Design a protein around this ligand. Structure first.
Ligand SMILES: [Cl-]
Ligand SMILES: [Cl-]
Ligand SMILES: [Cl-]
Ligand SMILES: [Cl-]
Ligand SMILES: [Cl-]
Ligand SMILES: [Cl-]
Lengths: 173, 173, 173, 173, 173, 173
């Protein structure tokens, strides 16, 4: 409310609400990815676990944004959550490509909000993103890039064998 | 898939997917309730905590359903998640009335799925609901009923004072 | 001194000295608030403790600024400390309103110094404020806002009773 | 207030308020002394620490007086705090001479308040000063005297070397 | 690579490579300083240790930059490392003056990279420098300034004696 | 210096300085190798770790030589460090071949210095090399030879798969 709000623009308030929606939609996508890899006809437990953990991380990102919104005196507004873009996600390689595209989209939304906060001279917002989101995102994207490279070197050789080895020897199970 | 599926009707498969949607929408509603009570102009920490815990419980209910869907060889299908029915939730009394209506709707969906499973002679489904959902729901609704009665006796007396006392002396903070 | 000073403008040096004065004056105001609530004819121990703790926090803020001033090679200059604006502070509600006004004034001074540092391309100063002051201030103002709302809901009901309950059940004693 | 006040003269009440001002001004002077010795072009950490500790002790003395004022039913009244008498404090010798002058002034104010309390037959006040202030002050002044003598014997020999040795081998760092 | 790179300019990539070179050259200079003070005809163990520790810190700074370069999808490129500017480093005073000049040069390179990142709207880079380099550098330069002042006060008095005392009583051995 | 130097030829002094340069250049090469394998488009963590550890070992070898130089009364002289011979290092096989060539070059420089020390009847130098370098080098080269053989047997079969297996099952991560 108005009792505490200080130096917090309506444009930032609205963008924060949009970003919450994007994080929750990412969480939902990761939930779908995770349960796909737990199907009896897919059955890659390490891949399932990887995406389930990301679903949790994105949900937590949204909750941190909502906490911040209240700390600044903005008002959280929730919208419909669009279902994930696919019902089936293909191979580990297809899934990891889809995940890195998703993360780059989230990262772009973070960068755009940082630029808005810079333009509106809102240093608390800029710091908040720097401290809790931007470096986490860079580290995650690097990890996904590393995974992509390793999956590609394996399935180029021999696809089924390669996918099993990656799940067994890289991913946690 | 077809490799494991046994005695698992398409009608039950579809209803399970619908029930996942209903649990996730309940989780989302509770997320909105929780953050409403964390607003600086509402500021009832115990109420916030109560609804945040319920958001987690409903999400976990959905995840258990999705696990079961895969164990039976059904295929999870995700739909859009409708936003919560309100943006602001009124007083603790208004919120607790809305929550018990929501839980009765979930309970009815559980009972309807149990009846379908009975009709289709699917004892695993019926047991699964009995063991993980039906008694949890009855206990939760009883707790909400108890809360409603206590809130009503307090705010009938003196509304602001009453709401504070309930949050301080009944709810966990 | 000149031996270490690098990228540290005279405008920032002077503003830092002014900010030290503002923090020390805030500390002094909180000392007066705290001892007011320890009077035998006021006697709200939890309120006394709350403001005494804030006096300590603001003094520590000033000491951190003075440490930073020396680390950058600026020179601390001390001015007279103006006495607090009131000798008696009214009710818990009056006191908490006065405190949030004071904190918003401090927050504005922080934001103005951050803007100056941005304009002078002094990233160390900007980081220092972000890391040690801006988020602490936002969190404090949110907490005071929450308190204000709870005090208002209580004393609207029944003023003396309400003030006692807040001190007993919200504030630490 | 009047509810508890007994055998507590208006003259003593006023003098106690004056003494609080003198202690807080002493604390402020010691804060300036301490940060002077932390300058990069002074850089005597042990001297800095010595005066910072005294700033804390004098602040605590003021807080004890304010507590006593309330225990007797007097009313604390705060005045402006005059800035310290110097912006730069010279050598360790200059600083220690200034500190002992300050302490003798505080001690004289304590003795004058004790005499007033004796004249007004206020044994609680006299005891309070004896038990919490007078012996502490005598011990501090003796310690400062000892320091002065040691600094003088060192800087008479060789000023820069002497000041370093005193800071390293007498003062705590 | 291109798979992960996002919002990372070629100008920043190149400057990061240059900064790695500057840190490694600083590390090398400190290695030379450290072993100079371990010569039998110099023999100041505490001074040796001080510069050896700085060699390690600068190497670690370079490694952190190289890690960051890879996390952003840039490509590390290594150049020749220029030998230190001197073969013999004079007295402790001469050495500490040379070290503070070196650190101010590094600090300027950090500030210039921060300005470039600000201009290119690269908040991750700006945060990275703020969080890992800028405050460390300010603290180090302050410590070197303090040392310089203490060395100057000692060797003004009596040069050989003064240098020994500083090494024994200030520096760690 | 001349105060301690005994049976330490100028030819050995100079060769020791050259050997320090060769060790530091080896360390630098290993730093480049290590960070190459940490690229998102290479992404072999175990290989990265292997070369990073060797960078540390070679740096430590140089520091031991510099310590010895001072213990004998020689004077360390530092030269420019040439950049590594390649900017990109190819596959694990290419990298391990380059590393064994580098180690054989270092080993030859050690053997040549031992021969010089033998010819100059400097038993301390000969012992120092025997005790700290020659056996370490033989053991390292044997380990690299073993690795080469295992990498060759794997990538002859199936290159991408083979390189992944070696990194996962032989190298430490
Ligand atoms: Cl809608
Ligand atoms: Cl749709
Ligand atoms: Cl004045
Ligand atoms: Cl006044
Ligand atoms: Cl070259
Ligand atoms: Cl050269």
């Amino acid at each position: 409310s108005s009792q505490i709000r200080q130096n917090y623009s309506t444009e930032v308030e609205a963008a924060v609400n949009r970003l919450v929606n994007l994080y929750l939609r990412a969480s939902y996508t990761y939930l779908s990815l995770g349960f796909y890899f737990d199907r009896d006809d897919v059955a890659l437990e390490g891949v399932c676990h990887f995406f389930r953990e990301l679903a949790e991380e994105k949900r937590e990102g949204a909750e941190r944004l909502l906490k911040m919104q209240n700390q600044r005196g903005g008002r959280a507004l929730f919208q419909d959550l669009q279902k994930p873009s696919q019902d089936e996600w293909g191979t580990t390689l297809d899934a990891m490509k889809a995940a890195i595209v998703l993360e780059k989209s989230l990262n772009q939304a973070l960068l755009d909000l940082h630029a808005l906060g810079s333009a509106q001279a809102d240093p608390h917002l800029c710091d908040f993103l720097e401290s809790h989101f931007l470096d986490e995102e860079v580290k995650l994207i690097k990890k996904m890039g590393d995974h992509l490279t390793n999956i590609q070197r394996l399935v180029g050789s021999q696809a089924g064998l390669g996918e099993y080895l990656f799940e067994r020897l890289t991913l946690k199970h």
